[PDB]
Structures are given as C-alpha cells and as structure tokens.
Design a protein around this nucleic acid. Structure first.
Ligand SMILES: [Cl-]
Ligand SMILES: [Cl-]
Lengths: 353, 356, 353, 356
DNA sequence: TAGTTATGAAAA
DNA sequence: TGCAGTTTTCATAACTA
DNA sequence: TAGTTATGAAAAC
DNA sequence: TGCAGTTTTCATAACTA
DNA sequence: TAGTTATGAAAA
DNA sequence: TGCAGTTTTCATAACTA
DNA sequence: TAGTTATGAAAAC
DNA sequence: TGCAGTTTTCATAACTA
C-alpha cells in the first residue's frame, strides 16, 4: 500500500521512515543466493519495520549482509549518510531537489573514488524513485521528485572507467613460477597452489573457484571441462588442459580424504567448509609481492582480468572472451580490446615510416 | 480534446474499457504504418475505435488494423483486453477491494493478473504483456485530467520478468545439407525454379522473410560477379547485402524466363500466379518442408532460423561481430549476439592460449 | 515581447496567430543567401503581421520562397495543414498534446514518405517550442507544452534512412559515354555537356555548378582547381584533371563570347543569367533515360551520390570523401561506407570456404 | 532549502547577484573535482559563496576554487559577473525599462550584453559566455519558488553564435625538424635529460599536457620493445597508448638515473627539484622555446599543437579516424576530426579516381 | 494444386 | 546485468479459385 | 526552341 | 552521438517571345 | 636558474 | 548542419628560493 | 598455524 | 547504447582454539 509523503511532524524521522521502507523493499528483491540461513533474513525483514533510528537500520543491514544478503551494502550506508546530512543541516521533504543532492555528493563522496560516487548516486536514484511510486496522501495526490541527477560529474560511463589492472604475458608466467617457488606449509601447499593455478588458467571468479564441486569436473582427451554453478540452477563451463594441474590435482585429492569435506567441495578448510575470499586474497597477494608484481590491484580478480586480456591478445575473438569469462554483456568483454597490442601497434608504428 | 477525467463512468469496468480503447487508438496513430497497403483502412479503424464501447468491438477493430498492415497493434490489444476481462470478472465475482474503482489498480493487482493469465506462456510473451500494461497506465497518467485540471497518478513500474532446448540454428555441415536438400527435394515444375531461388537467397544473405518476399529486380545490381542487393529492412532500416552470382546465376535466369508468363506487379522478383507477393505462410511451409525432408527439424524451423545460421557461420569465419551487425542490420553487438551461436567445444581454443 | 497564450476568443484564430509569429520569426533567422531582392522579403515580413487568415500566410510564404527565402517552405505548408486539422476538428490551445499531434501526423502524412513525416514533426516541434518561449499572460504565468514527440514511428535516424540512389563504376562510364552520344542542338551541346561532365567528375551540387565563376578556375600541371563559393564569403575547392574537359571547355568559352553573360558566370542562358535547376534536371534525366539507367532518382544530385560512392570505393578515405564532397559532418560522409564492396565481400565470401 | 522566491530583495541588482552566487556554488558541487588536491579548499569555497553578497567576493572565491583544482568554475564565473556589471551599470546609468526588475530580463537583453562585452573576442569565447548565461537562468527557472509554490519562467534560449589563419599543426617534415631541434637546442645539464624525454613522449603519443606531467613509472609496461602506457585522461577517461622503446630507451635510462637524486613524490616520472609535478607553464615555455628555435612558430605553439600534429600524421599514415579516436581518447569521429588536418593538395587523389 | 487470410504466441 | 519499447516472424488452422 | 517560374514533396545537409 | 534544426534538390506542371 | 602561481582567453 | 555543456590548454604576466 | 568474520570502499557485472 | 540497477570483490582489521 501507499503512504502519504509526509506522515510525521519531523521530516528527519519521515526521511528515516522512507529509507527503512526502501531498504526493506530491496531486501526482498535483491538476490539471496549467498544467504546461508533464510531465517536471519526473515528476522531482518520485520526488524526494518520496527526500526525507528539510523543506528537500528545500519545494525540490521549489517546483520543481513553478514547473513548472505550482500547487495544491501550498496544501498544502506550511502542512504544513511544522506539522512545524517539531512538531519544535521529544511522544514519539509519537498525541499529535497537535485541541487541539494549535488551538495551532499560533493561533501560526502569528495574524497572517494568515482566508482563509489556512482554507487551513492544510484542509491539516491532508487530511494527517491521508490518514494515517487509509493507516496499518496489522503487527498489521493502524490508528490513526484523525478530525480535523475544528470548534471553530476563522473556519473556516466567512460567517466572514471578505470581500465582493469592486470598482468601481461610475461608477468603471468612469472606469477605462475612464483606459485611453485614461494614457500608454503605442507598442510596447505598442494591445495592452495591448485586453487590459484585453476584461477589463473581459467580466469574464474573468486567465489566461483571456492565453490567448485568435484562432480563438475570432466576429463576428456587430456582436457578438463569444469562446470560452474551460476544463478538459478544454471551452469557455465570452462576448459583447462590436464597437464597444467594433473599431478597437483591428484596430490590434493589424496590429502583431501583426511578432511571432513562437505557438499562435494573440491577445496575446503580443516573444518570441511568452503574457503573464504579473505584467505584466498592473502594467499594470492603474498605471491604477487614475492614475484615483485604488486600494483593497483593484487587479488584473484586481477588474475581474472589478466586471463581475459591474454585471451583476446591471443585469439582476437570477442565472443570467445565472453563465453570463457562468463560475461552476460559484450560491453564487459569489449573492455579488454583496449589492450589490443596489434591495435596499439598500428598507431605507434607510424614513426617507423 | 484528447484529455478526459480519470473516472467519467459509474461503471469502473466500462471506464477501464474506455481508456484501453483510447490507448489502442493512440497506438494506431503512433505505431508504424509502413506495411499498410490502404491508409483508408487505418482511418476506418481510427473512427471505429471511437464508437467502440465494448471488448468485442476493440478486438475486431484491432484485428482489422493488424490484417490491414498495422502489425504492431497485435502486441498491445490482446494483453489489455485480457486484463479488462480480469478486472470485469473480479468485480462481478469478487465484490471486494480494488475492483470497485480503477483508482485502486496498483502493482499488486497487475502482478496477480500476469500470474493468472500468463501461466503456460514463454518469458518473452510474459514480457510483452508487462510492456503492454505499463504503456496503458503510462497513457492514462499522461491523459487523465478533471475539470479542475487535476490528475491522478498511477506511476506503475512493474518489476522485471525473471531444461536445455534443441538447437535454434544449422551449423556449417547442416547448412550444406540443407542447400543440397533444396535441390534434392521434389517440387512441381510450376514452382520449383521460383521457390528454390527464393530460399537460397535467404540462406546466402541472412535476409529476413518479408525482406525476401518484397524483393524487386531493381534492388539487384550486378558487377564483377557480385550482386549488391538493397534491402528495405525491419523498421524501414536500409542496408546493402552482397550475394556472389555463381550461387544463383543459372537459377535466376531460369526463373526470370518463367516470370515473363506471370502478371507481375510492382517489379517483384518473386510472386504468385496472381502476380502479387508471396506470403510468410507459404515461405514457412516451403522452408519447413525442406528442413523436415533433410531431417533437420529443431526448436525453430522457419526462414528466420536460417538467418540465425547465416550470422553464426559469418562470425565463425570472420570473428567480427560488427560485420554480422552490418549484414543483419543491427545497431548494437548485443542484438547481433542473439543470432550468433557459440559451440561449447570452442572453449578449448581458450584453454590452449597457454601452450603458444 | 511575449504575448499571452490565449489572447483571442477563437482558439483557431489564436493558433493562426502563433503560426504567423513563428513563420515571421523563421523568416528573420533562416538563410537569405538565395534572395535576389531583399525588398520583397522585407515586404513579406510585415505582411506576416497583418495576415489574419491561412490563405494569406500561405500566399506570403510562397512569395517569400519564390523570392529566394527557400527554407520557409519546410515550415509553412506543414503548420498550415495543422491549422486546417485543428479548425475542422477543442475549446482551448491547451488541449493540444502529443496525442493530438500523433493523430494529425497519421492523417496528414500517412501517405507521404518518412522523410516528409520528419519535416512535419520538426515543424511542429519548432512551433510549440517557440510558443513555450514567447507566451506569458497578465499574471506573469506561462503555459509550457514541452512537446518532444518521441513516441512517433520513423522519426529518429536509421528510420527511413534510404541509402542514396546512385550509379556504380560501370553505370557511370555508360552515363559519361551517353553524354557525348545523345543528340543535342548545336546551340546548347557544348555548354550542357561541359556542365554535366563537371558535375559527374567532381560530385558538385546543382546550384554549386550553376553558379560557377571563371575566375575561380585555376589550371596547374594539367589539373584544374575549382573554387566554389559557400556561405558567408567562404570558398571550398575541388580538383579535376584537365583532359576530361579541356577541349570541351575551350569550345564553350568561344561560344560564350556571343552571350550577354553577367557576373563572370561560366554557364548561362541566352539572357546571360544563370541556368535553373529545372533545366539542369531535365538535361540530366533525358541522358539517364537514353542510357537506360533510370531509377529511383534521376537528377544531378544522384550523380553527386555516385561520385561520393566511387571515391570511397577507390580510396577508402573518409576524410577525403568529406573534403571532396564538401560535407560539414562526417555523419554524411560515413553514409557511403554502406556500399563498400571490399566490406560486403568479406561477408558474401564465407560460402567459398 | 535550496529553493527561494525569485525576488527576495528590493534591489534587483543585489538579487541578481544573489542568484549568480547560488548558481556558481551549485557548479562547485557538480563540476569535476578530480584536479582538487585538498577537498577542504572546496568546502571553504562552498561556505564563502554563501556568505558572499558582492561581486568582489564571488570573483575571489571562484578564483580560489580554480586555483585549488576546481578548474571548471572559470568558464561560468567571469561571464556572469560581467553580466551583473552590465545589469548594475545599466540600472544606475539608464533609469528605464528592464533594469528595474530581473523579471524583465529576456533574450533581447542577453543579446545586447553579448554584443557589448564580447566585441574583440573569438567565436569560441562568445560561445562560452552564451552557455554560461543559459546555465544561470536555467538554474533560476528550476530553483525559484515563492510562498505559494509558484515559480517564474524565463525559458531563455539564445540563438547560436554564427581571413585565413596560420597552420595549427606540424606536417610530416616539420615534425621531423622539431624532433631534431629537441636534441639540437641547448639545455642545462640539470634539465636536459628530463625535458627532452618529456616533450618527446608527448610528440610520439599525442598525449595531453597534464596527462604527460602526471605520468607515473607504474604507468609504463615494457614488452618486446613496446611501452604500453596507461593514461588517466581528460574527464577521467582511461586509455592505453603505445610507444616504441627505441625512441626513448637511452633517454629514459639517463633521466631515471638523475631522478634518483630527486625527492620524487607519488612515483612521478617527471618532477621539479622539489619532487613535485611540473606545471603547464613550464612545459609550454619549454615547447615554445624549441618551436621558436626551429622557426616553426604558427597559430598555436604549445604541446597541444603537437597533439594535433600526432593525429594528423596518424590519419595520414593509416586513413583510420577510429584509430585516431582511440589514440586521442574521443567518443566521436567529429571530435577527432578537429585534430586531423587535411592538406588541400590531396584533392588530386580524388581527381585521379577516374584514371584507374 | 498453389497458395491465401487470420491469429495467439514468441521473439527481435 | 538487462532493460527501454517498437516491429517483426513463428507456426500453425482453415480455406479455395 | 531554349529555357523559365512555381510547387508539394523528399531529401540533404 | 543522435538528434533538432536548416538548407537544397526532386520532379513535374504550365508555360512562352 | 629553474621553475612557480595566477589568469582572461580559447578551445576541446 | 551544428549543437548539448563539462573540462581542458593557450599564453602569457609577475615572481623567486 | 590456518584460517575466520566484519567492513567501508571499489568495483564488476 | 548508455544507462539504472544488481551482484561481487578489494583489502584490511581483529581476531583465535
Ligand atoms: Cl558482463
Ligand atoms: Cl554534411
């Protein structure tokens, strides 16, 4: 049902009221695939109704995110920062226009990345669009903000579109060698090296590699076909030559038998559960450091960008890049064409004539 | 004039029916009329939509409009009339809540209707119903206005519509077999030359069905063994496609001789015995007949499936999606990707980049 | 100064009132370079003020167009057709929305080309945008139509963007031969053949060729540089090998001495004035007919499209096409890339493998 | 809050001054702050624009903002303050007509101001003044609102702004001479290695001035004799450019050794003796010094002129405007065309298409 | 035969 | 990641000079 | 003959 | 980066000392 | 020297 | 044909540890 | 040791 | 054809039988 735009005497509390509604609305629409316990999310749902303060909204949203409802983080923090802006420094909610929002973005996201700025703007757009569709007074009249925020700097594409940090061909080989060269304890060496090499050789995402199942591995003519579970019982596939991981895979599978592994996980901690992104990052980063390859990004996804880049350099096949990386949009795949050596060569070689 | 108060009738059902008619009429003036032969048929539909005060009238007139060439009206008419049926039935059967006034029509109500009337339908069809509903209430929001110049705001924004299937294209080998089957399958002497030329042109160019059926001889330009064909495409988008002459030279000359005995109209390349353009129904049955004969039946079995096959082969040989985009007449890579199918086995081309 | 939106009791006359203002406004802003007598235009200016009927507006606009104010034709006829639509079949000007305009476009432009439809729409957009900026009542309040007409079919680019009718390489040669092969009287043969060949060899526009001056011809190393006067004392240049027109040029220049030529015109009628587009068209068309090359377009501009096309086929230089044809926008030059044989070949030749 | 009635002050001059301040303040929050070192300087400007009630204050604060990194504010400030001067002077000197109330500010008035204050200015500058004025009254139209929620509408839409000059680029031969002059001209041992490397990189890549001055060593990647350079460009647009190593290898190694003696900050490739990035002023004077020495002075004599020279040469060798578009970091062919200059003599390449 | 309308559905 | 929304074909049923 | 003016329509900038 | 907006030709009628 | 701010103007 | 409008460089003047 | 959870921030879809 | 909008990782803190 719709509520009047101004139900409370205090516009600050009234703003908090609409934010709580919007956040609860998003909690029901956003993906809950990473949610381990749906009961916790169900608790968060009604808690967003009984929440009457900024601290409570933040507390619940953190609880929901930590439960597996990850998407809520992109909306919660920015909007609650706006409530702080609106509360500190204005009699009505109608005073809120794009000019006020511009001032808010400047003050709160001024020292933040352009990508973060966009997240704040998108969060604002969603909130006031939600308000525009859910408000209606006793006189059956609705107030329409119609906020679009088009005049804000660095909000469109190509603005702050930082080309993905990655390794080239030579740097990748040095990283591969560094995996086997860096020291690791006997308890984790086989598992960790296998995990990171699979990521390097496939461009697999972090959570994709961490949730890999053994039954999804198929070996045919020296080639592994690895199935990766996606959204809604959907599977995507990647391929990997056996000789890259063959001896290392067998070594880990033997050790794995001494682990209390659950749910047919290929990789797991000592408790048998899937490894975290935190552990995977630190294991990847220390190798990056050891290889003297430290840069703007030093995680597993940086390796993912490296594979995509290498693949285009070697094949110049846009769709092959899409299908291998698992891109839903060719816009994403087209990003890696910006590193096309053969294309860059055409321009740089004009001086040789 | 074109603006009316939201509720003019005591009957919300009749009033909802009223707005639907107004919206569909607006669409008959705003949607493409390129396929319309006689514009007078459109004007008749425009007037008949005004005098319409029932569901049967609206359906008959919109069908009349579609059959006259205004093809786009078919996507809006039926879904809205099904909602009017839903609203009308609910108001009579369930005397409660929203169905007492169209002011109480909201997102929850539209969601239930889509859940009831689009049960065993594809996601694409469900998407069509949704877009239709959104358009109707967008029109009402813009066009409703009382005596005091005050309007009611719906602001309805429905959320997006969230096993493996058979192939929707012929691969390289299957394409070769289809081409052979075109010649191998039996056709009467009266139609064999014309029909073979028609289908083959479609195969080698990726031409849409209507684009092929409306080919004029003046659309062809021969130079150094190459036919440059000008195509008035979907949405009246023009593009040029090339067809090597050796693919159709003997077949074209054979049909053109037969064509002299036809009372051809509008300089059409292909025509029936009456001289008029062939229909999609005939083309489909002719194509499916060959597909079935070659044992190549799959998810789609029409000329459009051959269009998929063309784009897939084109990218397979050139690895250039822009080139596909040019040949098919698209504006973006995403749309061309729909026709460009990727064989999963080609993933080993990605796995082998490390060995080089 | 601004006027109230509704100054008259009759909305029909009030609409006619705004149209007359808009047309007069355009007559002052539109280019008057083709105007032979500025006095006639000055007369049309005040006549648009004293005009109190549709017939008078049409009469004046025709007068203005025939005087050299060509651009007025694109606005006059469509808007007066709208007044007819509004008068026939509504108490106020406020009733006019994009829904009414959609009905008007369907009824009046239904049997017309998509390009003509766009001209009607553009004319409407200008009128109601002009009204939005020039209306204000006694209460200092303005009514804003804000008409954009985005939901109308075939209004954007790529919609009805008919690829320019033209001749290919072989057809061009046959046309060139046909110029010398077709029969012409001794009084006009040298002049006409020279005129048409210059157009063919340069892709020059009709009015460009008709207004050519002798002083703008420069011969250097067997190559003619021809200057073409553009807008505001601006000149563009084309080049032409002498051997194409050398003997034919000298022949006409001798005959030209028996003409009372004015203003250093290269081509002229018997009265010494510049030839018309009408005469040039008929002379070009009859050759097209004679060559068996008749098609969708059979004028001098069709030859212009042919040159642009041939130039790209031979050079594949987009900027060269722009500079040779005199395009202000590369959007125009890029049109001829759609006929790129080498590009089309890449797709058609997939069956040969 | 951000909305105020159109006329709050009895003095229309003070009131016009008031709206200008509000508009410029909004621009300080909406324009790019990527060049701003200390964001606190921006916040100071924001507060000082509120307490400002005069022209001198607005100018000082906007200058302070520009000098702090908010470069875009310079295009709006001066033209509007010149209009405020025009309005203020006219109201005092000519006690008549529009200058009694800012409600009477219209198109005719703005046209006269542009005619008076932009006499001896370029068309581009005139265009800047126009855009500034349009932005101001667009802001006022959106932000004015009385106690009765009623607003005044300006709806001001100014019409567009309607001998031969010296070259604005170096051709192929001149480029070669410039490169020679870089080495031939005399520089002190302290700056010769650094300055030569800087300018040469600009020449061979078409890099913008600030893009070059802000180069980090981590931006360079060497592979098979090729340097791939990542550039954070204008409008924070990222692009990669390639530079063959043999052009700068000996010069780069020479400077890097000197660089070890510098207190370099932020891993900058080029820096002054303080370790901070070099200024556009220094770069310009260094470039113009070489140009003048080579006798190549023309319409433009800065590093941007070299950027023109790069694009012109690039298209001359490749005939690919998209390639130019990629190297320069543009979104359209029209913008790249600005840098791509066409030699009129090449028209004979068009005249010779008939002879083939 | 040799094709045509008409149409709810499914894309493009 | 996937729409905005207009404009086509699918895939038959029913029919005939 | 050898051209013109006038014009709705259709582009071409 | 497409658009709104401006400028020109199409293509034929109806002439004419 | 070896560079820096500051700035009205002119583009991009 | 050429903008919408934000974000840069031009091209000096004036100055100095 | 060998990993975890929590988190503002920054992307990556 | 860019977007609004959704989903995921970065990268570090603070732990701990
Ligand atoms: Cl993606
Ligand atoms: Cl152009």
């Amino acid at each position: 049902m719709k509520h009047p735009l101004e139900e409370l005497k205090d516009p600050t509390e009234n703003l908090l009221l609409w934010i709580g509604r919007f956040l609860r609305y998003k909690c029901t629409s956003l993906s809950n695939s990473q949610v381990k316990d749906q009961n916790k999310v169900f608790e968060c749902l009604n808690e967003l109704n009984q929440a009457c303060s900024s601290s409570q909204l933040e507390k619940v949203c953190k609880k929901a995110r930590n439960a597996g409802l990850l998407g809520i983080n992109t909306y919660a923090l920015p909007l609650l920062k706006f409530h702080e802006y609106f509360s500190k420094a204005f009699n009505s909610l109608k005073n809120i226009d794009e000019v006020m929002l511009a001032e808010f973005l400047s003050v709160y996201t001024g020292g933040l990345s352009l990508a973060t700025k966009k997240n704040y703007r998108i969060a604002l757009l969603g909130l006031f669009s939600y308000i525009d569709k859910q408000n209606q007074d006793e006189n059956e009249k609705s107030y329409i903000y119609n906020i679009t925020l088009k005049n804000i700097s660095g909000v469109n594409q190509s603005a702050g579109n930082k080309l993905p940090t990655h390794l080239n061909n030579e740097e990748l080989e040095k990283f591969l060698e560094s995996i086997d060269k860096i020291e690791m304890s006997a308890k984790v060496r086989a598992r960790n090296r296998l995990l990171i090499k699979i990521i390097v050789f496939t461009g697999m995402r972090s959570n994709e590699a961490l949730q890999l199942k053994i039954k999804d591995f198929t070996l045919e003519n020296g080639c592994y076909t690895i199935l990766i579970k996606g959204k809604g019982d959907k599977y995507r596939a990647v391929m990997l030559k056996a000789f890259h991981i063959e001896s290392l895979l067998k070594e880990w599978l033997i050790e794995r038998e001494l682990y209390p592994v659950k749910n047919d996980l290929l990789f797991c901690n000592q408790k048998g559960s899937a490894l975290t992104q935190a552990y995977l990052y630190k294991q990847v980063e220390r190798i990056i450091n050891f290889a003297g390859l430290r840069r703007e990004k030093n995680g597993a996804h940086m390796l993912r960008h490296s594979f995509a880049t290498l693949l285009y350099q070697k094949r110049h096949d846009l769709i092959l890049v899409q299908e291998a990386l698992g891109h839903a949009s060719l816009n994403t795949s087209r990003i890696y064409t910006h590193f096309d050596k053969q294309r860059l060569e055409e321009a740089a070689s004009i001086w040789e004539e």
